[PDB]
Coordinates of C-alpha atoms (C1' of nucleotides) and ligand atoms in Angstrom, one line a residue:
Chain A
X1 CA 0.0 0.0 0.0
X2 CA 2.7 2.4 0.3
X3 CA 4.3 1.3 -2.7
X4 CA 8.1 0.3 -1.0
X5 CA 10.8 -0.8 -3.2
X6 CA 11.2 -4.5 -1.1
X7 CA 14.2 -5.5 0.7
X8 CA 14.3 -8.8 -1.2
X9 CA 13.4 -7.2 -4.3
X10 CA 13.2 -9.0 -7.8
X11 CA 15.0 -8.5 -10.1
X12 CA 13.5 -7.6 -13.9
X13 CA 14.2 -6.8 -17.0
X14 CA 14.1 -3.6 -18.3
X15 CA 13.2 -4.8 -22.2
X16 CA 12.3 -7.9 -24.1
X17 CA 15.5 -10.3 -25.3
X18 CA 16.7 -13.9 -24.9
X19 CA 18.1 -15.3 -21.7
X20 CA 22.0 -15.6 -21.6
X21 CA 23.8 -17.2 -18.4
X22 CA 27.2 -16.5 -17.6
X23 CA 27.9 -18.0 -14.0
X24 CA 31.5 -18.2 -13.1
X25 CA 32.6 -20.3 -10.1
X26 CA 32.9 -16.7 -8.1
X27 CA 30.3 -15.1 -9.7
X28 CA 27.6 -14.4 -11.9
X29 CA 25.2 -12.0 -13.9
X30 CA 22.1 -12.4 -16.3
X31 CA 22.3 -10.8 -20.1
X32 CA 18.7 -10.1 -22.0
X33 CA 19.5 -9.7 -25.8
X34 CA 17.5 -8.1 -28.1
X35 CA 17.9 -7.9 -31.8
X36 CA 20.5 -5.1 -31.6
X37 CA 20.6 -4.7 -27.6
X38 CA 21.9 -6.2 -24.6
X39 CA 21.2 -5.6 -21.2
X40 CA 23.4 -6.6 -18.1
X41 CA 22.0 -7.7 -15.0
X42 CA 25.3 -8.1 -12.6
X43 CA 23.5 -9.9 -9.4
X44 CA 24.6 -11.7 -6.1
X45 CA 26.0 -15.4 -7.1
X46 CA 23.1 -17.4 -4.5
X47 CA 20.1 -15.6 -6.0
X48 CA 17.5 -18.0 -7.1
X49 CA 16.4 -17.7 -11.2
X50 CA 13.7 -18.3 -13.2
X51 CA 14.7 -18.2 -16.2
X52 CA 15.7 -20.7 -18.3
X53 CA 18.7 -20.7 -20.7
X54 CA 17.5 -19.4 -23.9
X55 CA 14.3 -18.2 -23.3
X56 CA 12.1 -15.0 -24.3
X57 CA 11.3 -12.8 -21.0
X58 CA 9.1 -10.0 -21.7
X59 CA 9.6 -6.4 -20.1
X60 CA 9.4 -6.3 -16.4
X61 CA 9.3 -10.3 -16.5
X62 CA 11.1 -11.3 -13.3
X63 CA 14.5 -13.1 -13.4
X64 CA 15.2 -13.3 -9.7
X65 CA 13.0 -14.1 -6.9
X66 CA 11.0 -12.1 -4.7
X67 CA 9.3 -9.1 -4.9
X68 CA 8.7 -6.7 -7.9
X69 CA 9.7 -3.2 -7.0
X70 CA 6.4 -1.5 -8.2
X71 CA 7.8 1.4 -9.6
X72 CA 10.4 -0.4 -11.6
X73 CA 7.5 -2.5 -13.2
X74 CA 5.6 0.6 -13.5
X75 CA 8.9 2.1 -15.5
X76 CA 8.9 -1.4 -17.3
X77 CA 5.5 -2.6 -18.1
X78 CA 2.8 0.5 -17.9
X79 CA -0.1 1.0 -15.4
X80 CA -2.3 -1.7 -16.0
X81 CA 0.7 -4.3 -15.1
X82 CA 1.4 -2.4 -11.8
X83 CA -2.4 -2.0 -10.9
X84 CA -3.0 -5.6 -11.4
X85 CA 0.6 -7.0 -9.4
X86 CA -1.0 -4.4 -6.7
X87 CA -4.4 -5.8 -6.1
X88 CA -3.1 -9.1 -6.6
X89 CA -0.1 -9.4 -4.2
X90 CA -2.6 -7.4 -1.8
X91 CA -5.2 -10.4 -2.4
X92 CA -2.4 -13.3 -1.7
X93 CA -1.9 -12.1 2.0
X94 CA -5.8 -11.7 2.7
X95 CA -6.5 -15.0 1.2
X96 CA -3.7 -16.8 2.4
X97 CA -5.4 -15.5 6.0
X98 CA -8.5 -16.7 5.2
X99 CA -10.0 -13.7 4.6
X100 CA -12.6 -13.1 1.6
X101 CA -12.7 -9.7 0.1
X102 CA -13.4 -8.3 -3.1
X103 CA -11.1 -6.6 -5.5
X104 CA -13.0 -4.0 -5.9
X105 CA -11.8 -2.2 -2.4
X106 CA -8.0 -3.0 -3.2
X107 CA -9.3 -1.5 -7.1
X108 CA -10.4 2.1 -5.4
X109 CA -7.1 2.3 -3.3
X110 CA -4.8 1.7 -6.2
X111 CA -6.7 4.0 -8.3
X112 CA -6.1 7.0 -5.4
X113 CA -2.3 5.5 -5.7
X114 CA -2.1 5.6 -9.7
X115 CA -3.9 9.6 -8.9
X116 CA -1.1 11.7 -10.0
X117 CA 1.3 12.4 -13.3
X118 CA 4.9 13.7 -13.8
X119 CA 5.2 16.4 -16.5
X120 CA 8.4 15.3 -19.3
X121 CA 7.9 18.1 -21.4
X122 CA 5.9 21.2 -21.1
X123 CA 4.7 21.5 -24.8
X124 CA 3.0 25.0 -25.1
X125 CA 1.9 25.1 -21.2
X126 CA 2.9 26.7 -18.5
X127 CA 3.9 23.8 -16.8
X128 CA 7.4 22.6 -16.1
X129 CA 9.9 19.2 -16.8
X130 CA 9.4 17.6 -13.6
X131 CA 6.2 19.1 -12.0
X132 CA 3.7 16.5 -10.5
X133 CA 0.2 17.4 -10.5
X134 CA -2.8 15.3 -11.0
X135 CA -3.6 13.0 -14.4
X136 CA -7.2 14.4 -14.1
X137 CA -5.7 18.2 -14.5
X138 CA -3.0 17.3 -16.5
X139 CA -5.9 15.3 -19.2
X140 CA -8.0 18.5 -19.3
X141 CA -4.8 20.7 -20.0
X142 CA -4.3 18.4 -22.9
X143 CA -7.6 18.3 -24.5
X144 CA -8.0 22.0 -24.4
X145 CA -4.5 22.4 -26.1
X146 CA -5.3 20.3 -28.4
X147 CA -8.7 22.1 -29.0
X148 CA -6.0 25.3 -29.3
X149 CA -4.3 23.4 -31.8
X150 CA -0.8 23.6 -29.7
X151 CA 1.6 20.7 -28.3
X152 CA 0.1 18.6 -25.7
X153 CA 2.1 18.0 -22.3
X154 CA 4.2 14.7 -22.5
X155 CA 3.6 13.2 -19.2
X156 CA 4.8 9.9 -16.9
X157 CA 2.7 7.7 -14.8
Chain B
X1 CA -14.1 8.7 -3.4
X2 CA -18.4 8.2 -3.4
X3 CA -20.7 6.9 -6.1
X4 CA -21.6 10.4 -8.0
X5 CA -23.4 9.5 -11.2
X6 CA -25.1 6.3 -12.5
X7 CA -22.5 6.3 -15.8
X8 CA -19.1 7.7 -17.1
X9 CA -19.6 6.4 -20.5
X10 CA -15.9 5.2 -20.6
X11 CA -15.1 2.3 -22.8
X12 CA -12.3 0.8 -20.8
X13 CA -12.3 -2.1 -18.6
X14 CA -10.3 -4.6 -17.2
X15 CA -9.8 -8.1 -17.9
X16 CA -10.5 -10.6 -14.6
X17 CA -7.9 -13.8 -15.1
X18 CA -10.0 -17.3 -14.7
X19 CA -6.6 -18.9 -15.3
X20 CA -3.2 -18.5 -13.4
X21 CA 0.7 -19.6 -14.7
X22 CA 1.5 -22.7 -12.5
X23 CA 4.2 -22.3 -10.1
X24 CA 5.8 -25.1 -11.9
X25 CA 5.7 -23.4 -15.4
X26 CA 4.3 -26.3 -16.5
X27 CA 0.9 -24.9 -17.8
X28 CA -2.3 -22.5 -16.8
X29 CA -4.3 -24.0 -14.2
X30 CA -8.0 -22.8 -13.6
X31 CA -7.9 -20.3 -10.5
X32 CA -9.9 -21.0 -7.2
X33 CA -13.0 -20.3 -6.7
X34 CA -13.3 -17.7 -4.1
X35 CA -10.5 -16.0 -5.8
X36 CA -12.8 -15.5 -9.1
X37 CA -15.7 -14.7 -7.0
X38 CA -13.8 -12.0 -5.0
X39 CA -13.1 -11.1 -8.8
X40 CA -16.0 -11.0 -10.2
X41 CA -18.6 -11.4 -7.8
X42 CA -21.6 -8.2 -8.6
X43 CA -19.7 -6.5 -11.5
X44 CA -21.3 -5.2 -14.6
X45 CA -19.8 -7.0 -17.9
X46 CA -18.2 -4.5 -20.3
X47 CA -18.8 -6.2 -23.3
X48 CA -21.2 -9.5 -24.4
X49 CA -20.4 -12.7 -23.3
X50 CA -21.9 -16.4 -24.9
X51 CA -20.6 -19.6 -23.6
X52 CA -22.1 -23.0 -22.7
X53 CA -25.4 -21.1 -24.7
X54 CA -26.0 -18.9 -22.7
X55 CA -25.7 -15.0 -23.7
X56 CA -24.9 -12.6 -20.8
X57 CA -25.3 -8.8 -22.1
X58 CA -23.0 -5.7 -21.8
X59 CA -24.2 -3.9 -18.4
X60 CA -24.9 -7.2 -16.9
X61 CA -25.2 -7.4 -13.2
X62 CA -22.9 -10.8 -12.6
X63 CA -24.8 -12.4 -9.8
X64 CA -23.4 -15.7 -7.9
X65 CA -24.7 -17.7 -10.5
X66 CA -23.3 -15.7 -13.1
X67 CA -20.3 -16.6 -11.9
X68 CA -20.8 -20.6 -11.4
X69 CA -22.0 -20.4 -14.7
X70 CA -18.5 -18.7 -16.0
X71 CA -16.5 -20.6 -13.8
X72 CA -18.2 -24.1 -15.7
X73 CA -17.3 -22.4 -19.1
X74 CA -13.9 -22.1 -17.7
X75 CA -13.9 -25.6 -17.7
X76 CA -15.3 -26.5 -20.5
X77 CA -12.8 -24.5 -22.3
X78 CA -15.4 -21.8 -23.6
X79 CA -13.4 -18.4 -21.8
X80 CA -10.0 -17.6 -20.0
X81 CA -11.1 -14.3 -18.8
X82 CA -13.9 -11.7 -18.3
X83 CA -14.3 -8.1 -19.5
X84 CA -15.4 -5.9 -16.6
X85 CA -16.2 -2.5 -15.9
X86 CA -13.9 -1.4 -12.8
X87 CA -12.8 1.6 -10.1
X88 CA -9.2 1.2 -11.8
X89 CA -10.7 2.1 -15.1
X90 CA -13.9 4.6 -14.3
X91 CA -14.1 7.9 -15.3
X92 CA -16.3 9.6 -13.0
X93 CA -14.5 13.0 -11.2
X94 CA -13.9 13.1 -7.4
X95 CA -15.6 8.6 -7.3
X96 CA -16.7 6.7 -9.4
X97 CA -20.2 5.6 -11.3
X98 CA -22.5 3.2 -10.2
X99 CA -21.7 0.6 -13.4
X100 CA -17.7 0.5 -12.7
X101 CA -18.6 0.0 -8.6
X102 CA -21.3 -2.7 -9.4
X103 CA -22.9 -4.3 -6.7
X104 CA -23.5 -2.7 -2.9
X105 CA -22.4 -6.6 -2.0
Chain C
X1 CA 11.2 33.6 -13.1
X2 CA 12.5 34.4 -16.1
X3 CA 16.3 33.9 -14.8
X4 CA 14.7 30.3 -13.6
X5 CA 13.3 29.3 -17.0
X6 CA 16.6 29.9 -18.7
X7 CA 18.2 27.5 -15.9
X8 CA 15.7 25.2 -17.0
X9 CA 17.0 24.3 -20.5
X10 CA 20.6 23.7 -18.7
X11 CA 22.0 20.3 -20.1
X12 CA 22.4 19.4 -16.3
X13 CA 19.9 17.3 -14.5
X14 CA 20.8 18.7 -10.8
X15 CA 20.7 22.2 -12.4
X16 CA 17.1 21.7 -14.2
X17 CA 15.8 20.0 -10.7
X18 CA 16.7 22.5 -8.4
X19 CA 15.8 25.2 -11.0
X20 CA 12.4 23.7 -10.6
X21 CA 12.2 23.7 -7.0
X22 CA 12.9 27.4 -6.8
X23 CA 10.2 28.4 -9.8
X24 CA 7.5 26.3 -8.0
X25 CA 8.1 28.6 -4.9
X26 CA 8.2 31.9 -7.2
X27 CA 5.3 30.6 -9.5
X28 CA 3.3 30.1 -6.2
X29 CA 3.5 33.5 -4.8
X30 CA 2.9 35.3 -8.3
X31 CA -0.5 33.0 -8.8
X32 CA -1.4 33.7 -5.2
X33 CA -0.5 37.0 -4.9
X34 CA 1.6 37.0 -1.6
X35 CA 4.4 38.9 -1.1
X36 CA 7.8 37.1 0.2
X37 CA 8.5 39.1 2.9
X38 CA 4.9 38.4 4.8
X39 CA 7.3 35.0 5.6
X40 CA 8.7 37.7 8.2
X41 CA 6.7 38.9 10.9
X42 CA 6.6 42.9 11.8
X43 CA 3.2 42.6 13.9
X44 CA 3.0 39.3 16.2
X45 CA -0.6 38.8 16.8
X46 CA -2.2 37.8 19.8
X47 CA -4.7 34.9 20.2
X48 CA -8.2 35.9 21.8
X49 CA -8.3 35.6 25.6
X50 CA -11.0 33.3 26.3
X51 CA -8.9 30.7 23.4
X52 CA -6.2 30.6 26.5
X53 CA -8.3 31.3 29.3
Chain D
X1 CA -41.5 22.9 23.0
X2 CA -42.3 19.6 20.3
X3 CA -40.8 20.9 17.6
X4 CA -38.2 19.5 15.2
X5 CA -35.0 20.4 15.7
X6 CA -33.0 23.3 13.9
X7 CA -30.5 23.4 10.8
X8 CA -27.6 23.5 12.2
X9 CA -24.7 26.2 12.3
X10 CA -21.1 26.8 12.7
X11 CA -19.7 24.4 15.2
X12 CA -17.9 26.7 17.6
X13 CA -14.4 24.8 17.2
X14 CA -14.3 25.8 13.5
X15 CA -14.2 29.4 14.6
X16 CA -11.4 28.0 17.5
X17 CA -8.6 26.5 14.5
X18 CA -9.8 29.8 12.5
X19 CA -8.3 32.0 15.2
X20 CA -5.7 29.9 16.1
X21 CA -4.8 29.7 12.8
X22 CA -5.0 33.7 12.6
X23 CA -2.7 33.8 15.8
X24 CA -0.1 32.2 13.4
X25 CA -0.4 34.7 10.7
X26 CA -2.0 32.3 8.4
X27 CA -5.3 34.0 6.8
X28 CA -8.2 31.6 6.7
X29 CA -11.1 33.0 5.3
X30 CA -14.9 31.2 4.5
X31 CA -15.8 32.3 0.9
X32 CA -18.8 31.8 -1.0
X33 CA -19.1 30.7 -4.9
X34 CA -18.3 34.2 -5.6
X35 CA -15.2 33.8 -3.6
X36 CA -16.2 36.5 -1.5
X37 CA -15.3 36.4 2.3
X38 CA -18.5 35.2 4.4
X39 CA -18.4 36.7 7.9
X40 CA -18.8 33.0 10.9
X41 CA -18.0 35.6 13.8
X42 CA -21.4 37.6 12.7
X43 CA -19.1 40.9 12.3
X44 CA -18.2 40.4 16.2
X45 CA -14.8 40.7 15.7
X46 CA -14.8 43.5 12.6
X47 CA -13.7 46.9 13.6
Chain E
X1 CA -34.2 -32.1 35.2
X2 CA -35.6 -29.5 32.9
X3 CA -36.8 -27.5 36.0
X4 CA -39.4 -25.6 33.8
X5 CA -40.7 -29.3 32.4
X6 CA -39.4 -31.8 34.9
X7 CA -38.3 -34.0 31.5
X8 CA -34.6 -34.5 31.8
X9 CA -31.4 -32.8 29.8
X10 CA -31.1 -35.8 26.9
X11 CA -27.9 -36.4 28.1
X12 CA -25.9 -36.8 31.0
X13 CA -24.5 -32.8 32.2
X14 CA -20.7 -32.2 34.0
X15 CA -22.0 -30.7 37.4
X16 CA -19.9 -30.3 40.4
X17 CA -18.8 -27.2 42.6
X18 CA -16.8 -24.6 41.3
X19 CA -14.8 -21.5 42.9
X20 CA -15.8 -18.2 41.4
X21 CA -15.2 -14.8 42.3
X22 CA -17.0 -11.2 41.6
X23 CA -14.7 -8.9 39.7
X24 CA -13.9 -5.8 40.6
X25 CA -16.2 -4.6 37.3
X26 CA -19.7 -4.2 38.9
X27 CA -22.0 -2.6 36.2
X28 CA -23.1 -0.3 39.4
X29 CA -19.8 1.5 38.7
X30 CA -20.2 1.7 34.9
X31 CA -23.8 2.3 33.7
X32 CA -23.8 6.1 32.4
X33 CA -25.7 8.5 29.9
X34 CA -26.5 12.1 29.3
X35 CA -29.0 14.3 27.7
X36 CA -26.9 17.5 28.2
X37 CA -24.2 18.7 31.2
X38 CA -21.1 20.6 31.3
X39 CA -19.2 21.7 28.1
X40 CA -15.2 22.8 28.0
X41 CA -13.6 25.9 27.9
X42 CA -12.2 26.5 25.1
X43 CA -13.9 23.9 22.8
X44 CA -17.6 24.2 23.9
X45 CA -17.3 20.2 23.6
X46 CA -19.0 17.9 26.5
X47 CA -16.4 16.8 29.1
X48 CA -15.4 13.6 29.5
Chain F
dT1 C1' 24.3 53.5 45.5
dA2 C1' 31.6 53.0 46.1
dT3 C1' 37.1 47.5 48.7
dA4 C1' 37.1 43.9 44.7
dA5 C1' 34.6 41.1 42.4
dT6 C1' 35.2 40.1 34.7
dG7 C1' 33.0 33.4 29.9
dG8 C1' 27.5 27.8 32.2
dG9 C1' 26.6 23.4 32.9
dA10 C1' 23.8 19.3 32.0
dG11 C1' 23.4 15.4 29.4
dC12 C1' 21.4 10.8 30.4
dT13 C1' 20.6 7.4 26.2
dG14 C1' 13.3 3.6 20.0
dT15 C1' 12.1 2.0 15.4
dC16 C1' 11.4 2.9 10.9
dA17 C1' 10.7 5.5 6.5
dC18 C1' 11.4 9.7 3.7
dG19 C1' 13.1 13.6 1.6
dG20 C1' 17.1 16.8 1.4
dA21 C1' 22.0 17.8 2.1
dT22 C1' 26.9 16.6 1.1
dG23 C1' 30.7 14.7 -0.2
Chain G
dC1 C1' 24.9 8.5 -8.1
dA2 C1' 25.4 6.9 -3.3
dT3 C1' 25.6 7.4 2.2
dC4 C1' 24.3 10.5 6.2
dC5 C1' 21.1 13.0 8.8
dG6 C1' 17.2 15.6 10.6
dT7 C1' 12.4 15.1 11.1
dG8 C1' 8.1 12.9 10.9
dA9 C1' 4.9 9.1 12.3
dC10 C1' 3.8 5.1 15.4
dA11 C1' -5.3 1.9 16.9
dC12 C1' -10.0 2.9 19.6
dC13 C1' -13.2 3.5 23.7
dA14 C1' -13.0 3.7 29.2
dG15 C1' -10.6 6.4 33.7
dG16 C1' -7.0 8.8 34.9
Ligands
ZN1 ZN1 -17.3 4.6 -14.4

DNA sequence: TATAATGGGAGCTGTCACGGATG
DNA sequence: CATCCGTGACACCAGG
């Protein structure tokens, strides 16, 4: 609920590729290869995988165990991926305590959570590279730009 | 966040899993089923739905049964997953509408 | 502000940040229309006595 | 007296974190759609 | 034996003497209301 | 209203997360 | 782009 990067935090991948293991007897790291990229994931050499050699992981797929940092799968995989890891990692605690409770409660709470936007580029507004301010506002200022006919604001989830 | 208007028109939704990936990779395995009815359970379909012959219409109110009744398509094969109108999705100002919400369980 | 916007377009992410932080300040008192120095106090007031009887 | 009970008005706590509020130099003022000032000390405490 | 029947429990009860003691938490002590009384100084809020 | 006097003195013992400062 | 540090916050009613 408050959205923590874990202390036993997963590990995932920033883009799509193929798996590529290189483990030496004193270390290790992960490589995710795209058609004309490579990614490096340097991690500790007792970390438990789940990834086969050779295989396809999409972005924000987990490699390591543990927990998904939300903002890094938010960074990775969009809004609808973070709402739905949310409400479901959420669920697993309450269920696993025999408590029944519907999504839609854990739904209204993430929504509040997924309430605000960070500006990446101003367009024609008066806004800045950075600001935060709500997706609501930041929607409206959009559509009535676009009814002026000037650049939209780029914004971040 | 309160119920402010019966409809926000929005066309989004979201989509409830009936299937999960095994923790062995192996396959998809059909879900539990308090997990679908915690999932389901009272929420208005965002678009039409037929299996096992039965048609269950756009702004449909799932009851209990409806969601027996999708849980036996599961198994049969018919569906993996439900189009629903949803909080995370509504587009209603300062709440929500009363079709996203659904039920008062 | 207008020194502030030119910071802005500085290749430096640091610069650009902190650039920010300061123009949300000044942008606040233009749009509200406080001045700065009301942050100082010339006149302490004094609650009602029946509020601290 | 039998008869139903009144609309209510300002609880007198709201005017307590208004003055308080006041006796930290911060200016909180009740407005209306207009956004002009509406008067909860009924002018008792306008010279 | 039922005493408001005189027919008996169905089965067999667990009956013998027991040693129990009054608390310190009489309802005498406890039972409270209020229609109006005392407010506070500077909150014109009913006491506690 | 006058001798001279010229720099204090406690403190007493969380746990975490977060955002800002520094280094 | 890290570590260090100062400052927040840490359930409700009851009686006290
Ligand atoms: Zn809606």
């Amino acid at each position: 609920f408050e959205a923590r990067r874990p202390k036993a935090k997963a590990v995932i991948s920033e883009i799509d590729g193929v798996v590529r293991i290189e483990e030496t007897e004193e270390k290790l790291s992960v490589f995710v290869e795209s058609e004309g990229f490579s990614k490096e994931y340097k991690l500790p050499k007792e970390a438990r995988l789940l990834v086969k050699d050779g295989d396809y992981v999409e972005a924000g797929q987990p490699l390591t165990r543990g927990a998904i940092d939300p903002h890094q799968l938010l960074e990775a995989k969009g809004p609808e991926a973070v709402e739905r890891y949310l409400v479901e990692e959420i669920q697993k605690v309450y269920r696993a305590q025999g408590v029944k409770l519907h999504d839609k409660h854990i739904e209204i709470v993430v929504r509040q959570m997924m309430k605000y936007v960070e500006v990446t580029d101003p367009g024609d507004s008066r806004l800045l590279e950075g600001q935060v301010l709500e997706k609501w506002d930041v929607e409206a200022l959009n559509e009535r730009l676009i009814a002026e006919g000037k650049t939209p604001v780029a914004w971040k989830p | 966040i309160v119920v402010r208007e019966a409809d926000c028109g929005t066309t989004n939704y979201i989509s409830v899993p009936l299937f999960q990936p095994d923790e062995v990779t192996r396959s998809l395995r059909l879900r539990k089923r308090a997990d679908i009815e915690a999932g389901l359970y009272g929420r208005v379909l965002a678009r039409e739905v037929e299996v096992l012959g039965v048609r269950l219409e756009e702004g449909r109110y799932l009851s209990m049964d409806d969601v027996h009744l999708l849980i036996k398509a599961a198994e049969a094969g018919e569906i993996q997953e439900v189009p629903v109108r949803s909080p995370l999705t509504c587009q209603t100002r300062y709440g929500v509408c009363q079709k996203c919400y659904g039920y008062d369980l | 502000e207008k020194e502030l916007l030119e910071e802005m377009k500085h290749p430096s992410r640091a610069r650009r940040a902190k650039a920010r932080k300061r123009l949300e300040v000044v942008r606040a008192f233009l749009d509200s229309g406080n001045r700065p120095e009301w942050m100082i106090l010339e006149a302490v007031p004094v609650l009602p006595p029946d509020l601290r009887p | 007296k039998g008869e139903d009970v009144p609309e209510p008005s300002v609880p007198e706590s709201f005017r307590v974190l208004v003055k308080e509020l006041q006796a930290l130099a911060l200016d909180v003022q009740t407005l209306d759609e207009k956004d002009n000032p509406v008067d909860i000390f009924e002018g008792l405490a306008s010279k | 034996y039922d005493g408001r029947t005189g027919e008996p429990i169905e089965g067999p009860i667990v009956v013998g003497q027991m040693f129990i003691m009054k608390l310190y938490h009489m309802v005498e002590d406890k039972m409270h209301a209020r229609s109006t009384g005392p407010y506070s100084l500077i909150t014109q809020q009913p006491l506690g």
